[PDB]
Amino acid sequence: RNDVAWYARYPHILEEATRLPFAYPIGQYYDTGYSVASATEWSKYVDTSLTIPGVMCVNFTPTPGESYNKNSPINIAAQNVYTYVRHMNSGHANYEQADLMMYLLAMDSLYIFHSYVRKILAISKLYTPVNKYFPRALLVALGVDPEDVFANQAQWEYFVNMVAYRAGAFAAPASMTYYERHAWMSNGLYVDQDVTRAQIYMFKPTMLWKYENLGTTGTKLVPLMMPKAGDNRKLVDFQVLFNNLVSTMLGDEDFGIMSGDVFKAFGADGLVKLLAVDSTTMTLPTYDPLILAQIHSARAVGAPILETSTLTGFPGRQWQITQNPDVNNGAIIFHPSFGYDGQDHEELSFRAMCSNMILNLPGEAHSAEMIIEATRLATMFQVKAVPAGDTSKPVLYLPNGFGTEVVNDYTMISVDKATPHDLTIHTFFNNILVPNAKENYVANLELLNNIIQFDWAPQLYLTYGIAQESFGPFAQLNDWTILTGETLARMHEVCVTSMFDVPQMG
Amino acid sequence: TYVRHMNSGHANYEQADLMMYLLAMDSLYIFHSYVRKILAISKLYTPVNKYFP
């Protein structure tokens, strides 16, 4: 006997038969060819296409967390930060506690805008040969014309540096981890897996909050919609958005008084610091398992309701943080209605979000910080909003609670399988309607296969038009649990409390 | 007089608003120790007293 293996007797045969090219670049359409050469007689019955997506952008909206009355966590936080600022600024101050908190929320929307345009500037340096989505797909997902950023690099750099210089002239506490959380989410690129051909997660604000001081009936934060993906917006549009954001704050006396008071209370080492940007500044896609766990359990709440929204049967449901001194004893009030999808109709997919959510985690041992960070983008409906009128085309919902930000949409950027193989923009909620047409089933299947390329992708709740039936969470579960509205509301009420937290005076 | 001559500045409340705030604080602390006693009694076991808890 010899008892040596065949692969050890001829290792050259094995190493020659298995030399294959791997690491195909993504961002590029690939045609697989035919194994049966005669199968071109079957036109669409043979799928020879292979498109890999690269960008899924989480479209979000910063919130204070469901204010109903003066006992809300943002009003308790307003009380604590005004007690801290007031007993560090001995003198005569004219603003209330809620004017100070609304100044802090407008400061947050400014910092999100600055990190947004800085991400537009810092993405455009990204190149790698093995991912062709860099950097144009990431710029398409942020709503900017990518050629405008390359052609006007110095004007863009001046604009973002002047946004940092202007918006950085107002003080905000860095002891609040609210600003640090939005800076963490809003200027980071996140891979779904620690590989080089990984797929990118991003966070883009759907809307920001514009201050809008009015009359004598307090203040009223109103939405300012950001560019959506596929819009080829240029630098002048972002300049108009910036000037619309700080129109009521630049060179304003009351905002300067509040900024100097926050400067004197929290010292210069205890304020937030905006980041500068040059031609050297670039961000690299990092692996963060805390980001992926809350992208996984994210639930999209729909489009923001504006003044120009024409909700049939739902007047006055526009999203606004209000501070009327004659209403609710002068409490900061924010309770938006969810389930709006931009149009004046029912959107039957939101019925699929009326079941209890699934909280899915990797591993088998879960920390309390891990569990509470994995639930930060989740938002469950609790009741239906009451239709005021005879008929009502849409159906709105009221949650039990939400965190410092709600998800509005997701935007997936892939390549088209038809020539010239340009990028494709697909915007979706967690819920997806498939109406009865032949051009919807294979397209929905393509979208589902595109979504399952993303590792900790949000859980899908599809529904069918002729089946009258929603299917549950389309996601691979590892170690799951069923959450109810009260548990998630407890976690939201904990996290809104922790984000708006300041120390004491001693 | 103690709080006013440690908080140099303009205060709007009277002496009696401060004392009523202190009494309401006492009722809050009694409520907290009450529900904490509800929570801390429920651990008590002994075989020789079946009234626990």
Backbone angles phi and psi of A60, in degrees to 5: -125, 170
- Give the Cα-Cα-Cα angle B8, B11, B15 (nearest 5 degrees): 105
Q: How far is CA A10 from CA A1, A19, A87, A359, A474, in A?
A: 18, 15, 83, 51, 47
Q: Do A87 and B10 touch (CB under 8 A)?
A: no
Say if CB A458 and CB A337 are below 8 A apart. no
Closest-approach residue (CA) in chain B for A90: B9
Backbone angles phi and psi of A386, in degrees to 5: -80, 120
Amino acid identity at A23: A
Long-range contacts of A70-77 (CB under 8 A, 24+ apart): A70/A328, A70/A329, A70/A330, A70/A331, A72/A331, A72/A332, A73/A493, A73/A496, A73/A497, A73/A500, A74/A101, A74/A332, A74/A334, A74/A496, A74/A500, A75/A101, A75/A331, A75/A332, A76/A497, A77/A101, A77/A497, A77/A500, A77/A501, A77/A502
- The whole-angstrom separation of Cα A177 and Cα A181 is 6
Q: How far is CA A312 from CA A151, A337, A369, A433, in A?
A: 45, 14, 42, 21
- The method of structure determination was cryo-EM
What helix, strand, coil percent values describe chain A, rounded to 5? Answer: 35, 20, 50
Long-range contacts of A91-94 (CB under 8 A, 24+ apart): A91/B9, A92/B10, A93/A257, A93/A261, A94/A254, A94/A257
- Give the Cα-Cα-Cα angle A481, A485, A490 (nearest 5 degrees): 95
A505 CA: distance to closest CA in chain B (Å):
13
Residues 6+ apart with CB under 8 A from A111: A167, A172, A179, A182, A183, A272, A274
Name the DSSP class of A387: P
**How long is chain A?**
506
Tell the burial category of A255 from Cβ atoms under 10 Å away from its Cβ (0-12, 13-18, 19+). buried
- Residue for token digits 């697989």? A32
Q: For residue A59, count other CB atoms closer than 10 A to its CB.
A: 23
Helix, strand, or coil (residue A486): helix
A26 CA: distance to closest CA in chain B (Å):
58
Interface residue B5 vs chain A (CB under 8 A) = no
Pairing verdict, β A479-482 and A358-361: antiparallel
Interface test with A, best of B10, B12, B13, B28 (most A CBs within 10 A): B10
Interface residue A91 vs chain B (CB under 8 A) = yes
Say if CB A271 and CB A91 are below 8 A apart. no
Q: Do B10 and A90 touch (CB under 8 A)?
A: no
Q: Do A87 and B7 touch (CB under 8 A)?
A: yes
Name the DSSP class of A248: T
Q: Which of A226, A2, A265 has the alpha carbon at shortest distance from A114?
A: A226
Sheet holding A321-322, edge to edge: A207-210, A220-225, A321-322
- The whole-angstrom separation of Cα A231 and Cα A285 is 24
Helix, strand, or coil (residue A475): coil
- Give the Cα-Cα-Cα angle A304, A338, A246 (nearest 5 degrees): 25
Q: Do B8 and A91 touch (CB under 8 A)?
A: no
Query: A-chain residues within 8 Å CB-CB of B10?
Result: 92
Say if CB A414 and CB A132 are below 8 A apart. no
Say if CB A311 and CB A340 are below 8 A apart. yes
Closest-approach residue (CA) in chain B for A89: B9
Helix, strand, or coil (residue A56): strand
Q: Do A92 and B8 touch (CB under 8 A)?
A: no
Interface test with B, best of A83, A89, A90 (most B CBs within 10 A): A90
B37 membership: H or E segment, kind and range = helix B15-41
Amino acid identity at A190: Y
Interface residue B7 vs chain A (CB under 8 A) = yes
- The whole-angstrom separation of Cα A170 and Cα A262 is 9
A85 CA: distance to closest CA in chain B (Å):
14
- The whole-angstrom separation of Cα A395 and Cα A314 is 9
Query: B-chain residues within 8 Å CB-CB of A91?
Result: 9
First to last CA, chain A: 86
- The whole-angstrom separation of Cα A388 and Cα A399 is 19
Q: Which of A468, A213, A191 has the alpha carbon at shortest distance from A352?
A: A468
Name the DSSP class of A252: -
Amino acid identity at A150: F
Query: B-chain residues within 8 Å CB-CB of A92?
Result: 10
Count Cα atoms within 13 angstroms, Cβ side, for A371.
16
Interface residue B12 vs chain A (CB under 8 A) = no
Residues 6+ apart with CB under 8 A from A124: A135, A139, A146, A149, A150, A153
- Residue for token digits 């991912």? A131
Say if CB A277 and CB A160 are below 8 A apart. yes
Task: State this model's resolution in angstroms.
Answer: 2.8
Cis link prior to A135 (omega < 30° from 0)?
yes
**Considering just the CA atoms, what is the radius of gyration of chain B in Å?**
20
A113 membership: H or E segment, kind and range = helix A97-123
- The whole-angstrom separation of Cα A399 and Cα A319 is 14
Name the DSSP class of A424: E
Say if CB A159 and CB A121 are below 8 A apart. no
Q: For residue A374, count other CB atoms closer than 10 A to its CB.
A: 26
Q: Do A90 and B9 touch (CB under 8 A)?
A: yes
Q: How many helices (H) and strands (E) does chain A have?
A: 14, 17
* Encoded tokens for A374: 């994995």
First to last CA, chain B: 47
Provide the greatest CA pair distance for chain B: 61
- The whole-angstrom separation of Cα A11 and Cα A284 is 41
B45 CA: distance to closest CA in chain A (Å):
30
Amino acid identity at A203: F
B19 CA: distance to closest CA in chain A (Å):
19
Q: Do A91 and B7 touch (CB under 8 A)?
A: no
**How long is chain B?**
53
